[PDB]
Amino acid sequence: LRFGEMERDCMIAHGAASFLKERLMEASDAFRVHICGICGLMTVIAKLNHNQFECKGCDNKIDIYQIHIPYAAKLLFQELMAMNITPRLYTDRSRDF
């Protein structure tokens, strides 16, 4: 059954942050993607079981992170990249200055 926007809204009003996350992740999608620490893109060549990762272009091999997002969000970010848009996902609030 669809847990639409309107239902998403009632969970916010109740302030049920975890239940709302669970509906949108554990029930439904939820996917583990590998992110580059430099470009912050889903570039990272997931070479599991052989402990290798690496992001070509960035010449990165150590600065890698794993995020838990909906497959639909992963799909979206890829579709934005398909339209030449960079949805750079960063793991630290760092606004540097």
């Binding site: 059954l1 669809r2 847990f3 639409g4 926007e5 309107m6 239902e7 998403r8 809204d9 009632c10 916010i12 009003a13 109740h14 302030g15 049920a16 942050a17 975890s18 239940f19 709302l20 996350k21 669970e22 949108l24 029930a27 439904s28 999608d29 996917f31 583990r32 470009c39 893109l41 570039t43 060549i45 997931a46 070479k47 272009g57 890698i64 992170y65 794993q66 995020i67 997002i69 909906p70 639909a72 969000a73 992963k74 799909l75 979206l76 890829q78 579709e79 934005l80 398909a82 339209m83 030449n84 848009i85 960079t86 949805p87 750079r88 996902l89 960063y90 793991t91 630290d92 609030r93």
Partner: protein, 1405 residues
Amino acid sequence: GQQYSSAPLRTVKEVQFGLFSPEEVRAISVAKIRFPETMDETQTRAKIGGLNDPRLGSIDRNLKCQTCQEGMNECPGHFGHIDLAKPVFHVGFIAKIKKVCECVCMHCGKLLLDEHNELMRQALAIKDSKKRFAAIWTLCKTKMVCETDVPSLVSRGGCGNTQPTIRKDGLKLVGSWKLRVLSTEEILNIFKHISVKDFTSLGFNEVFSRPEWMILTCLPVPPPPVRPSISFNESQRGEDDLTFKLADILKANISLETLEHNGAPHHAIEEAESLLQFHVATYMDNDIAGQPQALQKSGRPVKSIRARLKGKEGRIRGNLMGKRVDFSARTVISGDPNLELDQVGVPKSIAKTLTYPEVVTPYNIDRLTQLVRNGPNEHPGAKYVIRDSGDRIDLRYSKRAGDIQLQYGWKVERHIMDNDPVLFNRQPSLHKMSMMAHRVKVIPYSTFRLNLSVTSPYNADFDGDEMNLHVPQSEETRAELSQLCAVPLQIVSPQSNKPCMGIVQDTLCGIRKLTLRDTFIELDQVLNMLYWVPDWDGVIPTPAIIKPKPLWSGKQILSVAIPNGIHLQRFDEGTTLLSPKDNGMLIIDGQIIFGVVEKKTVGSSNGGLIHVVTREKGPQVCAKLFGNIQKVVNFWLLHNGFSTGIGDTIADGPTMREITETIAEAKKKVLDVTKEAQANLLTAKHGMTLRESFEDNVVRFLNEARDKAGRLAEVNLKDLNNVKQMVMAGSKGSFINIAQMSACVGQQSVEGKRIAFGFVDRTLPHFSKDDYSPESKGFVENSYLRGLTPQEFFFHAMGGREGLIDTAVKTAETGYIQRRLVKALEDIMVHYDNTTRNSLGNVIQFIYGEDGMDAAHIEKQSLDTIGGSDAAFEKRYRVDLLNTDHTLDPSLLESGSEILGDLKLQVLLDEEYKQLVKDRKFLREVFVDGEANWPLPVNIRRIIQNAQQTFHIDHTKPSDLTIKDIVLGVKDLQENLLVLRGKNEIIQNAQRDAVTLFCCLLRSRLATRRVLQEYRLTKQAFDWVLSNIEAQFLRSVVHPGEMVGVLAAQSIGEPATQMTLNTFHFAGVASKKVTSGVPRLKEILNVAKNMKTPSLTVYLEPGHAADQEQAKLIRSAIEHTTLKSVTIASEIYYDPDPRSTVIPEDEEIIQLHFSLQQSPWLLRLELDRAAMNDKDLTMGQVGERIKQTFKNDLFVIWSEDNDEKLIIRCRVVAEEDHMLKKIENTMLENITLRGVENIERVVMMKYDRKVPSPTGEYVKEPEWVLETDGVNLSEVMTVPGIDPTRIYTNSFIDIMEVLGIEAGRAALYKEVYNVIASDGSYVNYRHMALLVDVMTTQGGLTSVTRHGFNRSNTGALMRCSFEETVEILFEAGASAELDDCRGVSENVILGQMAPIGTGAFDVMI
């Protein structure tokens, strides 16, 4: 589900939007992509080294993927690249390209106005990567030249080239010089250069987004998971549109590569160049300015990535904001008298499909073993056992399914069991009460059963409705449901600061029937009724009657269901403590003393049993009170019976005769008025037509008749009448229903008027032309009992249809309103500093609701100091110890006689009194009309009543208190009512402010004389009350984490859905025609510049406002009057002799107008005597006004005001004949005789007004008020005779422009409030205040639209979730925006715990 990763787990804290460098696309790439063909290379079953696969994901569930391996459901897919032969544009960026092109010089490659221009200097200074560029473009788009050098001469970089007048054509650009088309490779060369300093000023980022990157050089090739295959038949292909379009762009690219390094036909090469562009761009976005797309064996056109993300069933709305979920269930719903309020009846098959993942602990191991032993087919069972490693053991197939020796740390996916928290829901979810947590109760049968008293929040009925159930899959997720979402926690709602659940239907009906003084019960039934109550003490109450037979009253046995320490007092109309009619309500210690129990006591009412019991006993006890009352009443009623038949619609032979004559007299009123209208005797009132006046009268007579006939019927109905019985209880039906079924259905309306002449001059071809009679225009004389005639039948069907048509509209329209409201306020929440803030950290309110109180902990309380006379106030609050008649009697105090005289204690009583008189003045300045009842936290009356019972106060003995005990006691209590806590002055004054009105209430209720003479409290009881107020006040405060934006949105939105009729019920008078309901609510929210009903409401000079004459004068002074409005006809005669008329009537005028050259052409106007009298006009005024226009170039003569026919004669002081006909136009159309422009119609109205009398009390003192059609606030407010202090307009945009943002805000609230109030609905102040403040905080009026709120400084991922999805995302990349990920939407998109309630703080060790 996926493998283990060594890489550290972290959430997303920022989203840096940007643009891909072609060099970055090539670097990121894994595949070359040279071939347009799929995978079949000359029949061979593999993949081609061109399109899809060459190192980027398998499409055959093969663990192989270019060394990375992983296989599907683990591989994210990898990006490949494609080298474009010649540069191409981007569909979305096309507009930005042209805009950037009108800012930079072609050849030169530099910005046009740096940095001497005293416009561009100010424009450059503005902080924004969008609002800066907005000013810049507008400034240098006018420029046609690069400029050699600049003024103080000052020489700088600037060539001598004329900038083209760029124009967009199809999907290309055309430049005008004073010609030649603009090349995609040409535009790049300019953009490739620019300047890092200059370009960052025009909204770009050196790192993330450059304008040279808006043009495509290298296109990113999406992997197969983005564009997957798989069909219905396993013999053919079945490719994605995206794949077909990428093959199409490749065919176009290889063609261009061929032609370039082959015979280039000069102009024929550009025919293939324009087609490569109509592919690259059309794959990203179809549905543009040019043409659509092709078949390609599939259902034409191609969707494109743009369409994929486009809202409502699109990637954002349909997949991210909402999505289909597991652990969900659905069915038809049924009521259950025998189910607890917080319960839900779950069909056994559903309980057996849905599971909970329980970890094996020593506390459950025995129960889990047994459940695993029962398996998936026997109810308290399970399907699946998960061990270490994560392997699921399928209990329905495993050979070891009957073996299984559980181990701690394993999980058992057990069936849904009794008492599990579940989320129960009914769509549409307009409320948070539409989605509540219930306790599972596994039952036989295929429906979901629910307690009847939960029907209202869900807006559920059992006529086929279906509801949804969601299962929490985590311990914390179950806690969230049980501790925040539970049904008992929702009983008293913040929407309208009152219960949203109450006793309904059979229970509401039988509770009345049971409660009658006449209703008595015998032992046998009593015993059964008592046992039916689960909380029963086992003690048989002593029967009301002990004489020939013990006989218990209904009130007695129902009081068993009411818990102890419950006090309730009411008073209806004739209620007098001896309650003759058995009306009102008096409950002491949960025993009903008097008062028939109905809707006012036991419904969703404000200060009823339910609101009281929740506050007094608690939510868990209140939810038992539902069942307890249901159980007794349902049983008593089951044994009593209740019906309704045709006989209940029948009134007396005599009543019918009286109804029949009531209608015939109405029929004559309409005839007399008709006959009068037709004789030209009926005079029309100022502001309305003779025909409008007639229609208004006829409809009133006709409505009067239905109401009079109906009241005649209602009176005739006996108390044994079943319809009357249901109306008395308040379970179903109202007056109308009785009237329409028994007496007369009445007038039918379409578009607020009686039945229109759909045929020429008649409503039906059974009538003659020009028939305005009741029967002819839709008056249903008959009742549903008597039956309707065909004419009546048709007309009723016409009226009926208008209802179904707007029902259908006032659902899709309100649904859209609700969405917009929710989206705009989504992110507003109460922070840890009691502040009200959005995702940006911007302040909306400094204290939530202005008092920092939770709406569900607030109730309407009287402010005792505001009302009454100055003498009544004195008698109530004054204590003069230095007066023998005005002290406290020694029977009120232990110190009574010891204090008479005093002096030192009178300084304290004078301090007490002065603050009370100060309060009275203050309240009268806040609440001008003198309304005392206001929603405030802490019910003082209830606390007082509780101390009275708890301490067993005897109103005979004197109190042990002191003036100091009372006066200082109350004073210290005030210093303890915390809403805020900071030791600073800003915060201390904010705290002082928040608690002002409550301290008023408190002082009025806890004054010395009241505490002593009225309440008669002891020191014991007084000190308990003092601590109870402090504790309940502190409980009443809003909790930081409260999602008030969504609350407000839903609190306004929900009632709007329930707004019945777009046409207002003001059907009597035709001058009451102001836009209301959903059309108005839409005008307000969209901030419509062109509203349907703009209106000024004019209050006269304070004097002087009772003067009916002064009102008529201000009306004619302000109502716009032109010459057209007073003129019958205008004529042009040839009267050559200026002092001798050709017109014999005019002779007398020419005799005069000589003492105290021209033209032989006369312009002669005839004026209307009545119109001149309706307006405050005299010929002299009209004449001197014509005279003061053309002055010397026209000669004006006129007839006297007494002179029979009103005439104005004009003359012009070759080619003359036309000039005069031209003048007449200006004379009529362009001349103001008197009045204010835009103010069309002004009407005089007598308004009621509560004003303080010279003795203190509020008195009704009526006042003449002017009501306008049209608006000119600025001009009307300066008219003498008005009260410029009280002038009002429903055009809040004008109040904003004239008076400022704060007055605009107050007027915007008044507006929103009125829409809600006109519908009879009530919404708490704080919800509409929050809306109005949000629309206001920017200094202007920001609409709840894509234009309004959606264009603000908020996160790109949160804006795209609303509307204009793709375009928001395109400008985000181009401007190289950063998203905080501080908003709800970005966290929903990220599948992360949002900083809302539960996640609005961190939990550490």
